[PDB]
Amino acid sequence: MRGLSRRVQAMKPDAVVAVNAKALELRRQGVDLVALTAGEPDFDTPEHVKEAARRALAQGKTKYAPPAGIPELREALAEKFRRENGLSVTPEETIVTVGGSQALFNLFQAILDPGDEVIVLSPYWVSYPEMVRFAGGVVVEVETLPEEGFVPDPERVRRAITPRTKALVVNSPNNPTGAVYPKEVLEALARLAVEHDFYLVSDEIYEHLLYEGEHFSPGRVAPEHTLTVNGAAKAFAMTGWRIGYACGPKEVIKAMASVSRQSTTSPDTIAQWATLEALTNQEASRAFVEMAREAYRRRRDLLLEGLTALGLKAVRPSGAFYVLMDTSPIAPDEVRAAERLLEAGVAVVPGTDFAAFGHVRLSYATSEENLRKALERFARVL
Amino acid sequence: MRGLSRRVQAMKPDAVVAVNAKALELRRQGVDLVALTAGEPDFDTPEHVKEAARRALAQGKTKYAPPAGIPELREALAEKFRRENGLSVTPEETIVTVGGSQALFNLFQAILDPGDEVIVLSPYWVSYPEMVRFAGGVVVEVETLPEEGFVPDPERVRRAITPRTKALVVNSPNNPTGAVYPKEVLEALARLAVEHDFYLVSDEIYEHLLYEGEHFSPGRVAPEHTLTVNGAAKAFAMTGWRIGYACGPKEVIKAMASVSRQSTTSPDTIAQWATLEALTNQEASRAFVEMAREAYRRRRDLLLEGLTALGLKAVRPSGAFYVLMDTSPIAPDEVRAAERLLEAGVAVVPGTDFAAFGHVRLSYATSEENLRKALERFARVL
Ligand SMILES: Cc1ncc(COP(=O)(O)O)c(CN[C@@H](CC(=O)O)C(=O)O)c1O
Numbered sequence A, B: 001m002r003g004l005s006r007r008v009q010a011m012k013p014d015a016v017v018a019v020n021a022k023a024l025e026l027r028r029q030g031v032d033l034v035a036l037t038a039g040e041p042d043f044d045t046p047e048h049v050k051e052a053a054r055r056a057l058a059q060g061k062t063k064y065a066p067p068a069g070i071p072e073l074r075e076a077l078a079e080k081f082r083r084e085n086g087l088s089v090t091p092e093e094t095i096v097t098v099g100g101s102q103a104l105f106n107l108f109q110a111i112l113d114p115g116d117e118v119i120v121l122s123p124y125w126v127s128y129p130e131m132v133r134f135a136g137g138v139v140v141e142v143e144t145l146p147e148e149g150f151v152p153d154p155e156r157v158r159r160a161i162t163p164r165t166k167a168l169v170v171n172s173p174n175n176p177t178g179a180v181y182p183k184e185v186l187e188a189l190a191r192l193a194v195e196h197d198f199y200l201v202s203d204e205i206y207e208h209l210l211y212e213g214e215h216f217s218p219g220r221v222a223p224e225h226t227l228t229v230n231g232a233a234k235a236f237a238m239t240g241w242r243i244g245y246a247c248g249p250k251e252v253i254k255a256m257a258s259v260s261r262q263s264t265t266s267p268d269t270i271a272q273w274a275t276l277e278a279l280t281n282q283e284a285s286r287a288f289v290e291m292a293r294e295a296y297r298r299r300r301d302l303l304l305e306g307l308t309a310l311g312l313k314a315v316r317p318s319g320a321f322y323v324l325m326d327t328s329p330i331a332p333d334e335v336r337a338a339e340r341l342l343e344a345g346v347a348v349v350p351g352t353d354f355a356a357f358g359h360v361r362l363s364y365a366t367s368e369e370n371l372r373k374a375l376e377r378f379a380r381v382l
């Protein structure tokens, strides 16, 4: 008989997708509300990358591509993870997916049998649990503390390991805290995976938005259990392009390529060519990477000051582009504080779903003129 | 502990993906083998559509888009299904997905609880069962006969309806038979869905490659149970673009939008703008549609003749671009016949996986010069 399934019936809505829609419509019915919501640059994808997407169209590069992605993008990927991430993978252990989202979604479906446990460390990015659950798994969450700077303590984690525990999700830089996990913690979590036999998913998609610290890929350590998950969506202002990449054990890679086929067949072919240009033309991308990074650092400092100038508490991020801001003042909860703040003319994402209660998540990847126009409304409301 | 899941472990490989790879490498180890394998035009996506993808890049239209797709492409979609398909949907009941594949894959995950039954009519396109199974459902297949011209008989179907039966998959035009189901059969199958309360998935992606007959969208009939699934991949030579669309009950649409988000977030933003141009600039697309259709009809007739001239039996398709060709002569099975034929210098897809035993599936969407270079090898082998 008819009716929706119960796995798509049990999923919780995106807090981000929900807040955006809202913001938008008001921008439509009069309303000019500065929106510090979504995690996407304001910068437009570099010209050297665009030129190549035109060059792709021009050469009629519009046919189907392997479910695992074109052999070229695939090869440059084996040098990115290599040259940059220090990892040592051959192209067969590489895979192009439809965003960072696909590489995780395919990843969880290929290693999660119903009832398997996956340890997420809170606060976490809104999706991880929903993906881990849509696959049949169960969310075992380890807390990470503001007093500890949100960097995880491998003992609270080791403690969480059951015989069901199949995977552990680490994210450095971190959404929504901005925390950059230091080599040793990362190297520690890796050995837990090796010691208790489980996969370590490592979502290093903000590896480049690293203001202070060094970026360590845990995969260098546990190459047989680690599953690195990157993406060309943050580093190159390519959020609308929907290109992601990942790597790890050959074994689990082809399995992700299988789910890749039944679902999307393979990602855009024009977009894979453009992405290749971002990975191979170094001189031009490095120039852009650095350029963007500084505008982000500047915005961070500008925000973090003004926040502190109103006495609004928030932890200092060393990566990505989010600042978790305690709303204790504006209102009791994260919810109402957001409804208060939206009136003031500022769209923020409540940290209820990130397991960041009390706080609200704001993004400084937007204009400078805007962090300011927002910072002024906070004043009144404050 | 480690290891792959059992849902990605139980899936059978793509016969098409497998044959292609093969063909390629040989073209890639000396070998010039005419390949009538994949279902994709040789024509390159129209200029009016490409111009707009450049116009999109030019205006920096490269940010994230709603999981359900940009509101514009979404609105033109409510007029396509309306104006063209006679359906009556508002944009909320429209959805943009990553190809026709995604719209089905999201569709089966949103309405399939484990053990639910889905009736596929054989011969069917290679994926349907694989998707229906990856979701937990079970494949209950109704046969369609070459003597009946592959068009289904609603009684063998009515007969197959159990209390588990959740969905029924119809495909007109048909891959791999080319059969265009007549208004009344389609209108009948719809009433079974209404009578026994179940969803009718209708994969009308070749609606435009209709040489002889009229195209009926069953959704006009059972608007509450029908789930129309189209795609801009065949009509506009946009296979590499990966854009698909669908519509039906608001209820099931947002559920598909949910799975859409956790998996890909949303499709390419450049590509959604280009697609919009294909749907709104009529004068220019109709011109292309007709233009392509005739080159396809010509190739069909050219194939169907030469096939018959060698006494090779095959049914006459009135749609899409495949011809199911009985290999009884070349060899006993479909498998070996293909291995025989590959020697002759011709890549064909064995009909073992389409439930089209004895036959082999060949595509005439390729060059004319090629159907002929293939037709000559058949001779010798024959
Ligand atoms: C922590 C994390 N990991 C992966 C991704 C996915 O990248 P894409 O596939 O979507 O490009 C993201 C992405 N994004 C942001 C904004 C969003 O649209 O979800 C966020 O929620 O901060 C993140 O975080």
Ligand SMILES: Cc1ncc(COP(=O)(O)O)c(CN[C@@H](CC(=O)O)C(=O)O)c1O
Pocket (backbone or CB within 6 Å): A264, A265, B016, B017, B038, B039, B040, B098, B099, B100, B101, B102, B125, B171, B175, B203, B205, B231, B232, B233, B234, B239, B243, B244
């Ligand atoms: C019957 C049918 N439905 C869906 C698709 C794929 O939709 P898109 O997402 O690629 O637009 C196809 C198309 N082509 C192939 C299958 C494949 O391997 O791509 C086929 O005809 O062999 C078809 O048929």
